[PDB]
Amino acid sequence: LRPKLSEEQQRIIAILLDAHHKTYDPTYSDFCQFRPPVRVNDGGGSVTLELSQLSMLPHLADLVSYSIQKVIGFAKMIPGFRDLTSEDQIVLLKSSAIEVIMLRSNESFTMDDMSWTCGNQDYKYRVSDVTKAGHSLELIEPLIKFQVGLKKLNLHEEEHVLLMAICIVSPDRPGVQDAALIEAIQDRLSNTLQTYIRCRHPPPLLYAKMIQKLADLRSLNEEHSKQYRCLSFQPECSMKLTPLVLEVFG
Ligand SMILES: CCC(CC)(c1ccc(CC[C@H](O)C(C)(C)C)c(C)c1)c1ccc(OC[C@@H](O)CCC(=O)O)c(C)c1
């Protein structure tokens, strides 16, 4: 059966598209405001050198912090998110932050060269930049695998916004209180997505592939958290971060 999108589901799609359009700048016009990228000699990707310099960390922390602000803005516009308690809203935002960042970064990701192209060459990010921020291959390899896999799905903007919203409003996050209300909000979103795929996505399993991407995001989140922990041990690392990054990850 291919039921039609209800007027409510059409309203949800319109709200989420409008939310993304208001919170995502496809021109990357604010990037010149961040602390500048620094790309030092590190041809070998030396762990000792990367930790001593953390050359790309001030820029990447400003980029992530900026992205988190946009995610907070987007989440506030998800139908039903404001009905949740502010304690639950915060638990959901903190727990999903890195996952939504990985999802939203897909829009600038390019399979042409496996980079995130954000305007000029200074804002063309690669694997080597994440290593320059003190991260290891245990995070980077699955991260690129994820970007390619997601890119290959060729999601409609409607599916992309629905996927980010479903990611945020997850009832299975540690510390949530009203899991039942969260699940009801997510089910409303999930039903919209499944109905949308069946009636709007032309052929040539997409919903199941999008659900697997959410499971892939949990693993990446766990790996990122382990790496953030190592990075936090580096003396004076907090100066290279932001108050928002320190709260979300620390
Ligand atoms: C450079 C790659 C990547 C990929 C997800 C990234 C960047 C940095 C890191 C280290 C993070 C560190 O562990 C800590 C927490 C700061 C300490 C990692 C692991 C991946 C990245 C690329 C582009 C990005 O955004 C482009 C657009 O979407 C931005 C506009 C908008 O979102 O609205 C963002 C957000 C991130």
Could you describe the 3D structure shown?
There is one protein chain. This protein has 250 residues and is an all-alpha fold. It has one domain: Orthogonal Bundle (Retinoid X Receptor). It contains ten helices and three strands, in the order H-H-H-H-E-E-E-H-H-H-H-H-H. It has helices spanning 7-23, 47-53, 57-76, 86-104, 127-131, 137-152, 157-168, 179-200, 206-232, 243-249, and strands at 109-110, 115-117, 124-125. Strands 1-2-3 form a three-stranded antiparallel β-sheet. A hairpin with a 6-residue loop joins strand 2 (115-117) and strand 3. Helix 1 crosses helix 7, helix 6 (137-152) runs antiparallel to helix 9 (206-232) and helix 7 (157-168) runs antiparallel to helix 8 (179-200). The radius of gyration is 18 Å and the shape is globular. It starts with 6 loop residues before the first helix and ends with a helix. It binds the ligand CCC(CC)(c1ccc(CC[C@H](O)C(C)(C)C)c(C)c1)c1ccc(OC[C@@H](O)CCC(=O)O)c(C)c1. The site of the ligand CCC(CC)(c1ccc(CC[C@H](O)C(C)(C)C)c(C)c1)c1ccc(OC[C@@H](O)CCC(=O)O)c(C)c1 has 25 residues, from helix 3, helix 4, helix 5, helix 9 and helix 10.
